[PDB]
């Protein structure tokens, strides 16, 4: 269609077949037919017309690729020229990570609606994946403050790594 099914999965659709157990006519069936004739059909033709115009003028746009530069770990201290590139990279990855957590949150919300009253059991995978990604995001970026930077992120990581070393030292 338009989006990738892998990034935004949707289980296969299973609609039951009509099994009328009444002699009465179904009002929804005739309303659906009227909707197709009076709404879907004229709307579809107007779109097919517009698509005929867009095919006569076909042009492209691209997704910007960003080459990787050295991280703030490789920057000599107070070396602004290398700090600037690492800092800009870190900010780009920060925004992307925000959108990753949004994708995982959108999967979780779609599952909860889709599964209805069975969501508590049928959305356990999406809950787990959301829990893991939120934990990773919290470790990277939480508590940095409004004036966050790659330097502050590194200091937060080093503090976390030091505690992990000490806890293992206990073992």
């Amino acid at each position: 269609d338009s989006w990738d099914k892998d990034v935004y999965p949707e289980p296969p659709r299973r609609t039951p077949a009509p099994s009328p157990q009444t002699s009465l006519p179904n009002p929804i069936t005739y309303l659906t037919k009227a909707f197709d004739l009076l709404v879907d059909r004229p709307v579809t033709l107007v779109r097919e017309f517009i698509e005929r115009q867009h095919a006569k003028n076909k042009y492209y746009y691209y997704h910007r690729e960003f080459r990787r530069v050295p991280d703030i770990t490789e920057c000599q201290e107070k070396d602004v020229l290398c700090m600037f590139e690492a800092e800009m990279q870190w900010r780009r990855d920060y925004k992307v990570d925000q959108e990753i957590v949004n994708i995982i949150q959108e999967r979780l919300k779609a599952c909860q609606q889709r599964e209805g009253e069975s969501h508590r059991q049928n959305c356990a995978k999406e809950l787990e994946q959301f829990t893991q990604v939120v934990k990773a995001y919290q470790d990277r970026y939480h508590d940095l403050g409004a004036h966050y930077s790659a330097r502050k992120c590194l200091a937060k990581q080093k503090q976390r790594m030091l505690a992990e070393r000490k806890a293992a030292k206990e073992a």
């Binding site: 770990t73 490789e74 920057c75 000599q76 201290e77 508590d143 403050g145 409004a146 080093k158 503090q159």
Partner: protein
């Protein structure tokens, strides 16, 4: 350097200020403002009256200002020349440090909670 000299001869090894220098243009603008104030305090038509007088206000401001900027630029060249020559003569006072990357340098993290 030379005693009681406005522009020592060593200053001629420097480029002169360009006549389109933005600071010189500002100085000329001040001369123009002086001309207008001269007309205003004497109740003459401010813009129009005595254009020869206004011209001399602009020209004299630019003329003096050109030599001040020439001397200003020279004195900052002398400051830089003195400072670098002193650094060469006393290396031990200005050691070149060993630079460490942030992966190696420990910085404390202060949470904003």
């Amino acid at each position: 350097r030379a005693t009681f000299q406005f522009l020592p001869d060593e200053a001629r090894s420097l480029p002169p200020p360009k006549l389109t220098d933005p600071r010189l243009a500002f100085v000329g603008f001040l001369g123009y403002c002086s001309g207008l104030i001269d007309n205003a305090i004497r109740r003459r038509p401010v813009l129009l009256a005595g254009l020869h007088r206004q011209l001399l206000y602009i020209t004299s401001f630019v003329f003096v200002g050109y030599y001040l900027l020439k001397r200003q630029d020279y004195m900052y060249a002398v400051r830089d020349h003195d400072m670098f020559s002193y650094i060469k003569s006393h290396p031990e006072d200005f050691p070149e440090k060993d630079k460490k990357t942030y992966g190696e340098v420990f910085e404390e993290f202060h949470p904003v909670r």
